[PDB]
Amino acid sequence: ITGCRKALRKNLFIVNPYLRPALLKINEMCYLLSFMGLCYIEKFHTYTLQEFKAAQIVRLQEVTERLEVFRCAAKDVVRKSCRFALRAAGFIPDDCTYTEQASKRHHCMRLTCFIRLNDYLIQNTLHVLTVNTASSLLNFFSDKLKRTSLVPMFLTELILTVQSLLFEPSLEDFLDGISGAINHFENTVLSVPNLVPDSYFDAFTSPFINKKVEEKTCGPGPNLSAVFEDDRNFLTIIMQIKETIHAAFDSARLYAATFEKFQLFFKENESL
Amino acid sequence: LVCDNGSGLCKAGFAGDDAPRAVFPSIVGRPRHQGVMVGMGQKDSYVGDEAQSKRGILTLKYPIEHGIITNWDDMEKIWHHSFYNELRVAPEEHPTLLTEAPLNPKANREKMTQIMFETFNVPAMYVAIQAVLSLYASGRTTGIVLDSGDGVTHNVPIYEGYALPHAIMRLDLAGRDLTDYLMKILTERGYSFVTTAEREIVRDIKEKLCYVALDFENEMATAASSSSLEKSYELPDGQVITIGNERFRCPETLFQPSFIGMESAGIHETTYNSIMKCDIDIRKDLYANNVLSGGTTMYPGIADRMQKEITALAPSTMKIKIIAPPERKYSVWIGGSILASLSTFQQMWISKQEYDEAGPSIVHRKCF
Amino acid sequence: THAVPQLEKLVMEDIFISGDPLLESVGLHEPLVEELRANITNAMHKAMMPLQAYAKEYRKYL
Numbered sequence: 243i244t245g246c247r248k249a250l251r252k253n254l255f256i257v258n259p260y261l262r263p264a265l266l267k268i269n270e271m272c273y274l275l276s277f278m279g280l281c282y283i284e285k286f287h288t289y290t291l292q293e294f295k296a297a298q299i300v301r302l303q304e305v306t307e308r309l310e311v312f313r314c315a316a317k318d319v320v321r322k323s324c325r326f327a328l329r330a331a332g333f334i335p336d337d338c339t340y341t342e343q344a345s346k347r348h349h350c351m352r353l354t355c356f357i358r359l360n361d362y363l364i365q366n367t368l369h370v371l372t373v374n375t376a377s378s379l380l381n382f383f384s385d386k387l388k389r390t391s392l393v394p395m396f397l398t399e400l401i402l403t404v405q406s407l408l409f410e411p412s413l414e415d416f417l418d419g420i421s422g423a424i425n426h427f428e429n430t431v432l433s434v435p436n437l438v439p440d441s442y443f444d445a446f447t448s449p450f451i452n453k454k455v456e457e458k459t460c461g462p463g464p465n466l467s468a469v470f471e472d473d474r475n476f477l478t479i480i481m482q483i484k485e486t487i488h489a490a491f492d493s494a495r496l497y498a499a500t501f502e503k504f505q506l507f508f509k510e511n512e513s514l
Numbered sequence: 515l516v517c518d519n520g521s522g523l524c525k526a527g528f529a530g531d532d533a534p535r536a537v538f539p540s541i542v543g544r545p546r547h548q549g550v551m552v553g554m555g556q557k558d559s560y561v562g563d564e565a566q567s568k569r570g571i572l573t574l575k576y577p578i579e580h581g582i583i584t585n586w587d588d589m590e591k592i593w594h595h596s597f598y599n600e601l602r603v604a605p606e607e608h609p610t611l612l613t614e615a616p617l618n619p620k621a622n623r624e625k626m627t628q629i630m631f632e633t634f635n636v637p638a639m640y641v642a643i644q645a646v647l648s649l650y651a652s653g654r655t656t657g658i659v660l661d662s663g664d665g666v667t668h669n670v671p672i673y674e675g676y677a678l679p680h681a682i683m684r685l686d687l688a689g690r691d692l693t694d695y696l697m698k699i700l701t702e703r704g705y706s707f708v709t710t711a712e713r714e715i716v717r718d719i720k721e722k723l724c725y726v727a728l729d730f731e732n733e734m735a736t737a738a739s740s741s742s743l744e745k746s747y748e749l750p751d752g753q754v755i756t757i758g759n760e761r762f763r764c765p766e767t768l769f770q771p772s773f774i775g776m777e778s779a780g781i782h783e784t785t786y787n788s789i790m791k792c793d794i795d796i797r798k799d800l801y802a803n804n805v806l807s808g809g810t811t812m813y814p815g816i817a818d819r820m821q822k823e824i825t826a827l828a829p830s831t832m833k834i835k836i837i838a839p840p841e842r843k844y845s846v847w848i849g850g851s852i853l854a855s856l857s858t859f860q861q862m863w864i865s866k867q868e869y870d871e872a873g874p875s876i877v878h879r880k881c882f
Numbered sequence: 883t884h885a886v887p888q889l890e891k892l893v894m895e896d897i898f899i900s901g902d903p904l905l906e907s908v909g910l911h912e913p914l915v916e917e918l919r920a921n922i923t924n925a926m927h928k929a930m931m932p933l934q935a936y937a938k939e940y941r942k943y944l
Contacts, residue, residue: 245653249653259858356674359676599901
């Protein structure tokens with residue numbers, strides 16, 4: 243037990259009074275991300291597909307800027323903390339005995355893996371944010387759909403031509419346009435990559451030490467997008483949103499079927 | 515102070531003890547009659563050994579099972595008795611460390627934090643996720659956990675001291691399921707040991723006498739042909755029991771859940787699935803560093819069979835090692851008590867003043 | 883009756899003891915008490931009925 247205790251004390255970045263501050267700052271920022279949320283919905287309005295597309299894409303631009311500012315701030319905080327961790331350890335920042343230089347190399351390796359850990363955390367924060375807001379949208383749709391404070395979420399028009407009746411936007415326009423919106427969300431969330439691939443970490447993780455090169459593990463390790471593709475439940479929620487769309491259009495189809503009785507006399511009098 | 519909601523066997527110790535001073539069974543009793551029958555009923559509460567001794571006048575449940583605190587009042591009763599009887603102290607003198615299952619819903623996580631803070635006087639406190647500190651007892655920061663025999667059966671991949679929340683899943687079998695299958699095969703054999711006394715005797719049997727076949731088809735054909743591999747046991751009534759294929763059929767249910775009728779891939783393949791969920795870079799470390807835990811792992815042969823089965827699943831490039839702490843049915847408690855020993859950990863706690871503004875948010879955050 | 887402090891904690895002082903109970907006292911459902919409660923229920927409930935009878939004759943004068 244004392245042997246593994248010692249191995250832990252060696253390991254515990256989580257307890258070391260320097261990597262611990264850096265973690266605490268990054269963790270706080272992750273908290274601020276998780277609370278910031280994502281998508282927005284209006285409880286007392288009824289979007290056209292064009293309206294919903296525009297409002298959501300604008301919301302994507304807003305949060306994209308937020309996430310970029312956030313990431314670049316974190317990037318600075320990480321680099322500056324790493325430079326502290328070297329300078330306090332007797333290591334000189336690379337931008338600035340041989341076994342002691344190897345101890346520098348080892349220290350940079352652990353700093354690398356600590357950064358990568360922070361990236362894994364942030365990535366999971368984004369994953370949870372995305373799926374939870376998708377669940378919220380599903381709950382909005384289904385709770386309004388039950389009325390097929392309770393204003394319906396979307397607006398539609400019914401077109402009577404002499405030949406046939408159709409709704410604008412159609413089920414095709416809802417399915418493809420909301421798929422477009424969903425995929426804008428997906429790629430915007432996917433857009434900003436983890437920190438690991440940034441030049442700051444490339445340099446310090448590959449530190450030029452005793453005037454000799456060193457190397458490191460890299461961004462194509464940490465892969466949020468893999469688990470975004472793995473989350474069967476988020477994909478299912480999107481499919482069920484499409485089922486709510488389909489059922490609502492089935493109700494519209496029924497109403498248009500009633501309107502086809504009026505279309506009978508319309509076609510009769512227009513042929514007369 | 516160290517506190518464990520161990521759902522097969524709950525446990526407590528001062529921090530940095532060598533063993534949990536107190537070990538106690540995962541039960542609290544209520545009087546089974548609604549009136550106080552006699553002055554023994556000074557309380558409506560009979561935690562732990564109290565229930566075990568007094569079952570017949572008492573109402574009997576495992577208050578938790580699987581992934582959650584279920585029944586907050588009865589757990590608070592258990593913890594209160596843990597502090598006042600089992601730890602034999604008013605705790606607030608020293609920090610307290612507590613256990614939770616992995617992927618415990620954050621609602622429960624804060625609810626528990628609140629309950630502990632408001633109900634029990636305390637300087638500073640933390641609840642820890644059984645896999646993470648169980649891995650600390652391994653000494654790795656980077657490892658996958660298995661646990662069975664103290665809870666539902668988890669897989670948990672851990673990188674540099676933290677999980678991949680992406681990759682947490684249960685196999686919905688617990689210690690009872692082993693007793694259930696063993697009761698089935700005993701009743702087939704004809705012992706029909708199922709009464710609550712028989713149930714306890716069978717739990718003793720399964721704890722000491724289980725073994726895991728190295729290649730079940732071969733070992734089963736060997737024992738069924740060669741009954742020299744089936745071994746004798748003395749019952750409390752002086753009967754002799756013979757136990758044979760049952761010794762490894764029971765653990766085999768972990769490998770073939772359909773043996774207990776469960777439609778699931780075995781522990782090996784569900785572990786392999788969990789690994790595959792994570793980064794291949796982590797995956798190689800997980801194959802290098804597997805940790806198995808809980809009373810079901812305590813058996814002989816389990817870690818060898820698991821090593822072979824993971825090697826069969828693992829790519830031929832992967833190095834395979836099951837890491838099998840002789841204590842592994844306590845792994846979490848060992849890691850927690852060791853970590854809590856460290857005065858540098860003292861800064862990690864959360865305490866009253868920050869607990870007010872920060873505490874709801876800051877504990878939820880530090881709990882990760 | 884219930885609220886009598888368990889003797890141990892006052893009687894012994896030279897160590898911490900806590901989680902102290904009360905004494906035990908006779909509860910609310912020991913049968914002899916329950917049947918006394920029944921008897922007094924009968925006594926009042928039935929005695930109230932002759933007041934009904936007297937009110938009944940007064941109800942014509944009402």
